[PDB]
Amino acid sequence: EAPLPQLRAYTVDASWLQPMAPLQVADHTWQIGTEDLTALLVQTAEGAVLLDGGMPQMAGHLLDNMKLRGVAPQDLRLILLSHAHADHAGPVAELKRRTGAHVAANAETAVLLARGGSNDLHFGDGITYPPASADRIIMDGEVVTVGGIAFTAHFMPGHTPGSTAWTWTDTRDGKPVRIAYADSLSAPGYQLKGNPRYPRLIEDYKRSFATVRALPCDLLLTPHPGASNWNYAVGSKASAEALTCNAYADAAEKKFDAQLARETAG
Amino acid sequence: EAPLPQLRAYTVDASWLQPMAPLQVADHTWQIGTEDLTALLVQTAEGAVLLDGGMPQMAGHLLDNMKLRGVAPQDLRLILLSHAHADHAGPVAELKRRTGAHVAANAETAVLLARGGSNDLHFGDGITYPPASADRIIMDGEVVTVGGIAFTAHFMPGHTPGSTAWTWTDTRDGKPVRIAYADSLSAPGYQLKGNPRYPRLIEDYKRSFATVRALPCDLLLTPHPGASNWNYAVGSKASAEALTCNAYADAAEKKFDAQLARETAG
Amino acid sequence: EAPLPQLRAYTVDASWLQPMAPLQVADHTWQIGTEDLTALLVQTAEGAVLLDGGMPQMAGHLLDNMKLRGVAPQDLRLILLSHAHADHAGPVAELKRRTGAHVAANAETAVLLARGGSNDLHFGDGITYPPASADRIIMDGEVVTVGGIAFTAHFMPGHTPGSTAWTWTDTRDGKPVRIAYADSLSAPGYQLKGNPRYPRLIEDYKRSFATVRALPCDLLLTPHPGASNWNYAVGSKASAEALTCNAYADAAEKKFDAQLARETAG
Amino acid sequence: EAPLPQLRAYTVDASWLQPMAPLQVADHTWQIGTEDLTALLVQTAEGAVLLDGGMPQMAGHLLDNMKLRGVAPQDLRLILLSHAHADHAGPVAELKRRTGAHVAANAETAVLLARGGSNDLHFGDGITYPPASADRIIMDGEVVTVGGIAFTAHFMPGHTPGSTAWTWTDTRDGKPVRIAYADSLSAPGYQLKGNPRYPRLIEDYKRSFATVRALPCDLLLTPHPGASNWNYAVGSKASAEALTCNAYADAAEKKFDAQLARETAG
Ligand SMILES: C=C1CO[C@H]([C@@](NC(=O)[C@H](C(=O)O)c2ccc(O)cc2)(OC)C(=O)O)N=C1C(=O)O
Ligand SMILES: C=C1CO[C@H]([C@@](NC(=O)[C@H](C(=O)O)c2ccc(O)cc2)(OC)C(=O)O)N=C1C(=O)O
Ligand SMILES: C=C1CO[C@H]([C@@](NC(=O)[C@H](C(=O)O)c2ccc(O)cc2)(OC)C(=O)O)N=C1C(=O)O
Ligand SMILES: C=C1CO[C@H]([C@@](NC(=O)[C@H](C(=O)O)c2ccc(O)cc2)(OC)C(=O)O)N=C1C(=O)O
Ligand SMILES: [Zn+2]
Ligand SMILES: [Zn+2]
Ligand SMILES: [Zn+2]
Ligand SMILES: [Zn+2]
Ligand SMILES: [Zn+2]
Ligand SMILES: [Zn+2]
Ligand SMILES: [Zn+2]
Ligand SMILES: [Zn+2]
């Protein structure tokens, strides 16, 4: 008779694993991940910051791209996260071992990271990755500064309880560019209504749409570039179609409301 | 050009995942795992002890077999481990959540369990499983008692730094039966000589062969039943060919010495 | 010249350490702490729940009072917390070791408990106690059930980020009694305005006053009994002067507003 | 009647808390702790290593002395430990927060550090300090390298299960100086015989005396300088009376044997 099933790997679309060379976003900020997963390197005079790392197998590629930017592994000071799912926080444990960087995250993200994404409220154990510890717990609105560049956290729970937007002001052409790295606002396959593991899920998403609308933003980026209409594969045109924060929140809320009604409709 | 490779699942021989009904080993001790992975249930008047759980996907099967033995999930008091690899400690996190059982383990096993088997000294991240915490740290020779049944730990590092044998005295036919659950003594694909991550690996294995030879033992069991010549599929004959501790240690040391010479021979 | 100062113990008023016999609050609910620190035992047909434990040195007294109630150490299933300061979560690590109970707490409380109250946002390292791990992370509004008794969490951040109210329905004289165990709403010596470690502190307190006002409540209790006008020393009259949730929130908000104005006034 | 006792601070002799200016031990190695607690700074071209930090309240003094040596807080790369008691690992959590340094330690030291020294096998909760996590787990004989300087770990369990000696080769007057930082070999107030929490304590101490005798050593230092006959207060004569490793082990074993006989004599 049937044995128990084999473990199943977390597999993703090939484009999520397609390496790309560093793509400059602003004077200090570079996309160094893959064509379809964001990993932002912010280079300061006193070390570098990494916002997300993508999938677990991207660790070596990130370090290669850091080197192309002039950033040795030991020059990475800080890792920040949008949320601690395997496709965004995947390589954090290995990056910490190889660079000595600290991780700063809120308490929800810290607990999810420390169990390697296992016992996910919606996905169970299907997206487990190597666990890592947060070295600094941050609060809503708290400012983290590296090399004089200030990163502000904005909690936007929903996609995960610890989902966070990060904002900072870079420059281009002598003018300030307020960058907003807003987290995912999707709820893929989630039970939204009356979820015993997340009883206030709908209230949190609804508040998070409003938080995203209010972010300081001249240039929006998202963990999945397509969610904000970026196309990392087309170089200097990558940002051309990028959404505003208002438009990103509006699109996400329309999808959310439609899913809520479909969930009511079985 | 080539994308990065997909993550690869830890896949195992089908027999390792083949469920079996509880097989009685002695008056209080039952094999409740699969045909080719040991999971021992020891039933006391004040709750049950589980020694190993096998693969992550075995959690539900273990609880089903516990129920057949009269053990409700909440009746499981304690989980002990041979070593914290995915094929023996796989379901520990889920079992803790569903039963409330505590885990007792030495410090090496505790740290490996808490990172879900990631950053393995020999296997890297290939056998990651859901992380779990140890609630009680135990020392070499320490006695853990449940319902009056005393379990003694014997450290036998090598296969993992935290590899542990557990001994207890059960009964059969009114006579004592000294059970020894000795850990794996294999080194599959390991660099044995001059390993920078495990510099005293050879000294530890050699000492562990001697520890196994000295265990109090009328009946030897091992995490992989074939390592001690058990055959769980043949019921009342399962133990017929089981090795002594002396013979298990001798076979393991001969394989180890041969591998050492082959490693010297490239 | 002066050596560095000696470490300073966290010392408290004597009444906080004055043992008392169990005081019945409702049919299943007992105050089993000290005259001036709440520790609530809820006894079910399938084990007991403890809400808070007081100071670290109260562990033995709590177990003595449990025994007087018919609760053996192993009968304690679950520990819940108001917040993870030393005077309320102090003995949690020792209670877990001696009872096997699981701890359920939100992520903020879990991270503070796991560092033993060290690096407190307001108190630094002055109130460090033995660290403990949370076995179950709970979300706002999540229901935890033991022996059929359902406990609902209501997040009320401010006094700590993880501050939680717990509600359950007990009985007395054949009628339901909705019990609300609401956390502290004090801010003792806290910098309220522009606090870089807690930038939205004021917004959180203000929301928490509203949450407390809305709790289902026939009988309010608080970690410090005086905060809700209980007097545990007078037995059957202990609850006579107890505040409503509305009155507790109103008193706390008036104190908060006054402190805010004094902080503005240097 | 009597309330429960107040918590008691871990108080130490004043000389353990008496700051001193940096005292040069060899070309790259400086004592930067207090007159009676060792904290060794090793300065490399690629950052600094700290071996022990003393008491929790010494964090600021250590950073001041680092600054006098030209080491900014961010220049500290690595913290190593002799053992994780409050008088040697006390300030590790704060140093990690303020410097970004990683901690490397064996599994036993890592688990004790992570519970802040609470639930000590011999001292209970009396010497609890702020918990910290180890970022790198090291094995017996493993080499950790910073700026080209190689530090080798030698496990010497007894005083704690995780007690470790660290060796490295510095220079003086153009000649190599093999430095051995050997851990404590005391057993203050310990039950040595038949200790249920440490059943092989005597075997471990006896092996550790032999390990210390075998260390590569031109210059021995110890966490308590008096244990190896150092006197940090007399500057250029501080090392004059320092013991050899053989003499340190011999003195420690004689004290141990005498205590064993006194323990046998009640
Ligand atoms: C829109 C998506 C969907 O894809 C990923 C996601 N999901 C998946 O990759 C995918 C899925 O939802 O179909 C999945 C595959 C396998 C699983 O075991 C779980 C999820 O990553 C975990 C998720 O967060 O839902 N992430 C997002 C996102 O917004 O970040
Ligand atoms: C003899 C073996 C080999 O099989 C397992 C083992 N190995 C494997 O299952 C297998 C292998 O060694 O070929 C393996 C598959 C995939 C991997 O990524 C790593 C290891 O489990 C992790 C191991 O510990 O070596 N365990 C033992 C054992 O003695 O416990
Ligand atoms: C109103 C108070 C004040 O007393 C305690 C408290 N504070 C103290 O006990 C006390 C103080 O605030 O004066 C204190 C003594 C010593 C310290 O190091 C820190 C705080 O416990 C940590 C606190 O949370 O502020 N708790 C409350 C409370 O509402 O729970
Ligand atoms: C010889 C000693 C004695 O002093 C310290 C020690 N002990 C004490 O400081 C002291 C004592 O043993 O008398 C102590 C004071 C208070 C306590 O709660 C516990 C211990 O530090 C924890 C210890 O490790 O035993 N350390 C050593 C040592 O060798 O490192
Ligand atoms: Zn996601
Ligand atoms: Zn995603
Ligand atoms: Zn294995
Ligand atoms: Zn195996
Ligand atoms: Zn408090
Ligand atoms: Zn309090
Ligand atoms: Zn010590
Ligand atoms: Zn000491």
CSV table of N, CA, C and O in Angstrom, one decimal, chain C residues 91-166:
chain,number,residue,atom,x,y,z
C,91,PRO,N,8.8,34.0,37.3
C,91,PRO,CA,9.1,32.6,37.5
C,91,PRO,C,8.7,31.6,36.3
C,91,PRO,O,8.7,30.4,36.6
C,92,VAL,N,8.5,32.2,35.1
C,92,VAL,CA,8.0,31.3,34.0
C,92,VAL,C,9.0,30.2,33.7
C,92,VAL,O,8.6,29.1,33.5
C,93,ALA,N,10.3,30.6,33.6
C,93,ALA,CA,11.3,29.6,33.2
C,93,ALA,C,11.3,28.4,34.2
C,93,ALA,O,11.3,27.2,33.8
C,94,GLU,N,11.3,28.7,35.5
C,94,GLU,CA,11.3,27.6,36.5
C,94,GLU,C,10.0,26.9,36.5
C,94,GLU,O,10.0,25.6,36.6
C,95,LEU,N,8.9,27.5,36.3
C,95,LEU,CA,7.6,26.8,36.2
C,95,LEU,C,7.6,25.9,35.0
C,95,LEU,O,7.1,24.7,35.2
C,96,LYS,N,8.1,26.3,33.9
C,96,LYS,CA,8.1,25.4,32.7
C,96,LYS,C,8.9,24.1,33.1
C,96,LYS,O,8.5,23.0,32.7
C,97,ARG,N,10.1,24.3,33.7
C,97,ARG,CA,11.0,23.2,34.0
C,97,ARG,C,10.3,22.2,35.0
C,97,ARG,O,10.4,21.0,34.8
C,98,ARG,N,9.5,22.7,35.9
C,98,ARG,CA,9.0,21.9,37.0
C,98,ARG,C,7.6,21.3,36.7
C,98,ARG,O,7.2,20.4,37.4
C,99,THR,N,6.9,21.9,35.7
C,99,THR,CA,5.6,21.4,35.4
C,99,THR,C,5.4,20.8,34.0
C,99,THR,O,4.5,20.1,33.8
C,100,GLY,N,6.3,21.2,33.0
C,100,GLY,CA,6.0,20.8,31.6
C,100,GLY,C,5.0,21.6,30.9
C,100,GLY,O,4.7,21.3,29.8
C,101,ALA,N,4.5,22.7,31.5
C,101,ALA,CA,3.5,23.5,30.9
C,101,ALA,C,4.1,24.2,29.7
C,101,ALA,O,5.3,24.5,29.6
C,102,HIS,N,3.2,24.5,28.7
C,102,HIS,CA,3.6,25.3,27.6
C,102,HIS,C,3.2,26.8,27.9
C,102,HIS,O,2.3,27.1,28.7
C,103,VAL,N,4.0,27.7,27.2
C,103,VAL,CA,3.7,29.1,27.3
C,103,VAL,C,3.1,29.6,25.9
C,103,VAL,O,3.7,29.2,24.9
C,104,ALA,N,2.0,30.3,26.0
C,104,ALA,CA,1.4,30.9,24.8
C,104,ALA,C,1.5,32.4,24.9
C,104,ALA,O,1.0,32.9,26.0
C,105,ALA,N,2.0,33.1,23.9
C,105,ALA,CA,2.2,34.6,24.0
C,105,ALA,C,2.3,35.1,22.6
C,105,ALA,O,2.6,34.4,21.7
C,106,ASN,N,2.0,36.4,22.5
C,106,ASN,CA,2.2,37.1,21.2
C,106,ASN,C,3.7,37.3,20.9
C,106,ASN,O,4.6,37.0,21.8
C,107,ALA,N,4.0,37.7,19.7
C,107,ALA,CA,5.4,37.7,19.3
C,107,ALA,C,6.2,38.7,20.1
C,107,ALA,O,7.4,38.5,20.5
C,108,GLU,N,5.6,39.9,20.4
C,108,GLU,CA,6.4,40.9,21.2
C,108,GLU,C,6.7,40.3,22.6
C,108,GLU,O,7.8,40.4,23.1
C,109,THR,N,5.7,39.7,23.2
C,109,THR,CA,5.9,39.1,24.6
C,109,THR,C,6.9,38.0,24.5
C,109,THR,O,7.8,37.9,25.3
C,110,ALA,N,6.8,37.2,23.4
C,110,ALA,CA,7.8,36.1,23.2
C,110,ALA,C,9.2,36.6,23.1
C,110,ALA,O,10.1,36.0,23.7
C,111,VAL,N,9.5,37.6,22.4
C,111,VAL,CA,10.9,38.1,22.2
C,111,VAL,C,11.4,38.7,23.5
C,111,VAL,O,12.5,38.5,23.9
C,112,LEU,N,10.5,39.4,24.3
C,112,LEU,CA,10.9,40.0,25.5
C,112,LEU,C,11.2,38.9,26.6
C,112,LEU,O,12.2,38.9,27.3
C,113,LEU,N,10.3,37.9,26.6
C,113,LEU,CA,10.5,36.8,27.5
C,113,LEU,C,11.8,36.0,27.2
C,113,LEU,O,12.5,35.6,28.1
C,114,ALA,N,12.1,35.8,25.9
C,114,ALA,CA,13.3,35.1,25.5
C,114,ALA,C,14.6,35.8,25.8
C,114,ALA,O,15.6,35.1,25.9
C,115,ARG,N,14.6,37.1,26.0
C,115,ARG,CA,15.8,37.8,26.5
C,115,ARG,C,15.7,38.1,28.0
C,115,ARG,O,16.4,38.9,28.5
C,116,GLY,N,14.7,37.4,28.7
C,116,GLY,CA,14.6,37.6,30.1
C,116,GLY,C,14.4,39.0,30.6
C,116,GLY,O,14.9,39.5,31.6
C,117,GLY,N,13.6,39.8,29.8
C,117,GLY,CA,13.4,41.2,30.1
C,117,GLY,C,14.6,42.1,30.0
C,117,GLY,O,14.4,43.3,30.4
C,118,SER,N,15.7,41.6,29.5
C,118,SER,CA,16.9,42.5,29.3
C,118,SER,C,16.6,43.4,28.1
C,118,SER,O,15.7,43.2,27.3
C,119,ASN,N,17.4,44.5,28.0
C,119,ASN,CA,17.3,45.5,26.9
C,119,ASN,C,15.8,45.9,26.8
C,119,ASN,O,15.2,46.0,25.7
C,120,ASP,N,15.2,46.2,28.0
C,120,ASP,CA,13.9,46.8,28.0
C,120,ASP,C,13.9,48.2,27.4
C,120,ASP,O,14.8,48.9,27.5
C,121,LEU,N,12.8,48.5,26.6
C,121,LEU,CA,12.8,49.8,25.9
C,121,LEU,C,13.0,51.0,26.8
C,121,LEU,O,13.5,52.0,26.4
C,122,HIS,N,12.5,50.8,28.0
C,122,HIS,CA,12.5,51.9,29.0
C,122,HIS,C,13.4,51.7,30.2
C,122,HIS,O,14.0,52.6,30.7
C,123,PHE,N,13.6,50.4,30.6
C,123,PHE,CA,14.3,50.1,31.9
C,123,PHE,C,15.7,49.5,31.7
C,123,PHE,O,16.3,49.1,32.6
C,124,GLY,N,16.1,49.4,30.4
C,124,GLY,CA,17.5,48.8,30.2
C,124,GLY,C,17.6,47.4,30.7
C,124,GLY,O,16.7,46.6,30.5
C,125,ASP,N,18.6,47.1,31.5
C,125,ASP,CA,18.9,45.8,32.0
C,125,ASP,C,18.5,45.7,33.5
C,125,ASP,O,18.9,44.7,34.1
C,126,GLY,N,17.8,46.6,34.0
C,126,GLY,CA,17.6,46.6,35.5
C,126,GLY,C,16.6,45.6,36.0
C,126,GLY,O,16.6,45.3,37.2
C,127,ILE,N,15.7,45.1,35.1
C,127,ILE,CA,14.7,44.1,35.5
C,127,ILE,C,14.9,42.8,34.8
C,127,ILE,O,13.9,42.2,34.4
C,128,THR,N,16.1,42.3,34.6
C,128,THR,CA,16.4,41.0,34.0
C,128,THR,C,16.0,39.9,34.9
C,128,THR,O,16.2,39.9,36.1
C,129,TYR,N,15.4,38.8,34.3
C,129,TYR,CA,15.0,37.6,35.0
C,129,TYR,C,15.3,36.4,34.1
C,129,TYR,O,15.7,36.6,33.0
C,130,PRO,N,15.1,35.2,34.6
C,130,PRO,CA,15.5,34.0,33.8
C,130,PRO,C,14.7,33.9,32.5
C,130,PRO,O,13.5,33.9,32.5
C,131,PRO,N,15.4,33.8,31.4
C,131,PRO,CA,14.6,33.8,30.1
C,131,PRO,C,13.8,32.5,29.9
C,131,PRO,O,14.2,31.5,30.4
C,132,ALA,N,12.8,32.6,29.1
C,132,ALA,CA,12.0,31.5,28.8
C,132,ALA,C,11.5,31.6,27.4
C,132,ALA,O,11.4,32.7,26.8
C,133,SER,N,11.2,30.5,26.7
C,133,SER,CA,10.7,30.5,25.4
C,133,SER,C,9.2,30.3,25.4
C,133,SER,O,8.6,29.6,26.2
C,134,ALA,N,8.5,30.9,24.4
C,134,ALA,CA,7.1,30.7,24.1
C,134,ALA,C,7.0,29.5,23.2
C,134,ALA,O,7.7,29.4,22.2
C,135,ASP,N,6.1,28.6,23.5
C,135,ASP,CA,5.8,27.4,22.7
C,135,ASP,C,4.8,27.6,21.7
C,135,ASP,O,4.7,26.8,20.7
C,136,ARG,N,3.9,28.6,21.8
C,136,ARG,CA,2.8,28.9,20.9
C,136,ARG,C,2.8,30.4,20.8
C,136,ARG,O,2.7,31.1,21.8
C,137,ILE,N,2.9,30.9,19.5
C,137,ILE,CA,2.7,32.3,19.3
C,137,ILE,C,1.2,32.6,19.0
C,137,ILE,O,0.6,31.9,18.1
C,138,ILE,N,0.6,33.5,19.6
C,138,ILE,CA,-0.8,33.8,19.4
C,138,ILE,C,-1.0,35.2,18.8
C,138,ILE,O,-0.1,36.1,18.9
C,139,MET,N,-2.1,35.3,18.1
C,139,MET,CA,-2.4,36.5,17.4
C,139,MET,C,-3.6,37.3,18.1
C,139,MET,O,-4.3,36.7,18.9
C,140,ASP,N,-3.8,38.5,17.7
C,140,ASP,CA,-4.8,39.3,18.3
C,140,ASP,C,-6.2,38.7,18.1
C,140,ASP,O,-6.6,38.3,16.9
C,141,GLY,N,-7.0,38.5,19.2
C,141,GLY,CA,-8.3,37.8,19.1
C,141,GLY,C,-8.2,36.3,19.0
C,141,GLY,O,-9.3,35.7,19.0
C,142,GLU,N,-7.0,35.7,19.0
C,142,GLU,CA,-7.0,34.3,19.0
C,142,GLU,C,-7.5,33.6,20.3
C,142,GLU,O,-7.3,34.2,21.4
C,143,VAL,N,-8.1,32.5,20.1
C,143,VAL,CA,-8.7,31.7,21.2
C,143,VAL,C,-7.8,30.5,21.6
C,143,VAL,O,-7.5,29.7,20.7
C,144,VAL,N,-7.5,30.4,22.8
C,144,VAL,CA,-6.7,29.3,23.4
C,144,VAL,C,-7.6,28.5,24.3
C,144,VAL,O,-8.2,29.2,25.2
C,145,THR,N,-7.8,27.2,24.1
C,145,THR,CA,-8.8,26.5,24.9
C,145,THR,C,-8.1,25.3,25.7
C,145,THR,O,-7.3,24.6,25.1
C,146,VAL,N,-8.4,25.2,27.0
C,146,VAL,CA,-8.0,24.1,27.8
C,146,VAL,C,-9.2,23.6,28.6
C,146,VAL,O,-9.9,24.3,29.2
C,147,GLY,N,-9.4,22.3,28.5
C,147,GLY,CA,-10.5,21.6,29.2
C,147,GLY,C,-11.8,22.3,28.8
C,147,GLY,O,-12.7,22.3,29.7
C,148,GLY,N,-12.0,22.8,27.6
C,148,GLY,CA,-13.2,23.4,27.2
C,148,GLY,C,-13.3,24.9,27.5
C,148,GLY,O,-14.2,25.5,27.0
C,149,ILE,N,-12.4,25.4,28.4
C,149,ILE,CA,-12.5,26.8,28.7
C,149,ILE,C,-11.7,27.6,27.7
C,149,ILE,O,-10.5,27.4,27.5
C,150,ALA,N,-12.4,28.6,27.0
C,150,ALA,CA,-11.7,29.4,26.0
C,150,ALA,C,-11.2,30.7,26.5
C,150,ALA,O,-12.0,31.4,27.1
C,151,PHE,N,-9.9,30.9,26.3
C,151,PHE,CA,-9.3,32.2,26.6
C,151,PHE,C,-9.0,33.0,25.4
C,151,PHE,O,-8.4,32.5,24.4
C,152,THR,N,-9.5,34.2,25.3
C,152,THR,CA,-9.3,35.1,24.1
C,152,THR,C,-8.3,36.2,24.4
C,152,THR,O,-8.4,36.9,25.5
C,153,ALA,N,-7.3,36.4,23.5
C,153,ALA,CA,-6.3,37.4,23.7
C,153,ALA,C,-6.8,38.7,23.0
C,153,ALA,O,-7.4,38.7,21.9
C,154,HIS,N,-6.5,39.8,23.7
C,154,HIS,CA,-6.8,41.2,23.2
C,154,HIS,C,-5.6,42.0,23.3
C,154,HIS,O,-5.2,42.3,24.5
C,155,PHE,N,-4.9,42.3,22.2
C,155,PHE,CA,-3.7,43.1,22.3
C,155,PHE,C,-3.9,44.5,22.8
C,155,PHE,O,-4.8,45.2,22.3
C,156,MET,N,-3.2,45.0,23.8
C,156,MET,CA,-3.3,46.3,24.3
C,156,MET,C,-1.9,46.9,24.5
C,156,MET,O,-1.5,47.2,25.7
C,157,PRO,N,-1.2,47.1,23.4
C,157,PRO,CA,0.2,47.6,23.6
C,157,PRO,C,0.3,48.9,24.3
C,157,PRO,O,-0.5,49.8,24.1
C,158,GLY,N,1.4,49.1,25.0
C,158,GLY,CA,1.8,50.4,25.6
C,158,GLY,C,2.7,50.2,26.7
C,158,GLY,O,3.9,50.5,26.6
C,159,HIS,N,2.2,49.6,27.8
C,159,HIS,CA,3.1,49.4,29.0
C,159,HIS,C,4.3,48.5,28.5
C,159,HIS,O,5.4,48.8,28.9
C,160,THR,N,4.0,47.5,27.7
C,160,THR,CA,5.0,46.8,26.9
C,160,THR,C,4.4,46.7,25.5
C,160,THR,O,3.2,46.7,25.3
C,161,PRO,N,5.2,46.6,24.5
C,161,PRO,CA,4.7,46.3,23.1
C,161,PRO,C,3.8,45.1,23.1
C,161,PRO,O,2.8,45.0,22.3
C,162,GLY,N,4.1,44.1,23.9
C,162,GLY,CA,3.3,42.8,23.9
C,162,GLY,C,2.2,42.7,24.9
C,162,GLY,O,1.6,41.7,25.0
C,163,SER,N,1.9,43.8,25.6
C,163,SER,CA,0.8,43.8,26.6
C,163,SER,C,-0.5,43.2,26.0
C,163,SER,O,-1.0,43.6,24.9
C,164,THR,N,-1.1,42.3,26.8
C,164,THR,CA,-2.2,41.5,26.4
C,164,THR,C,-3.3,41.5,27.5
C,164,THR,O,-2.9,41.3,28.6
C,165,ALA,N,-4.5,41.6,27.1
C,165,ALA,CA,-5.7,41.3,28.0
C,165,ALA,C,-6.2,39.9,27.6
C,165,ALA,O,-6.2,39.5,26.5
C,166,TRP,N,-6.6,39.1,28.7
C,166,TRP,CA,-7.1,37.8,28.4
C,166,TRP,C,-8.6,37.8,29.0
C,166,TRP,O,-8.8,38.2,30.1
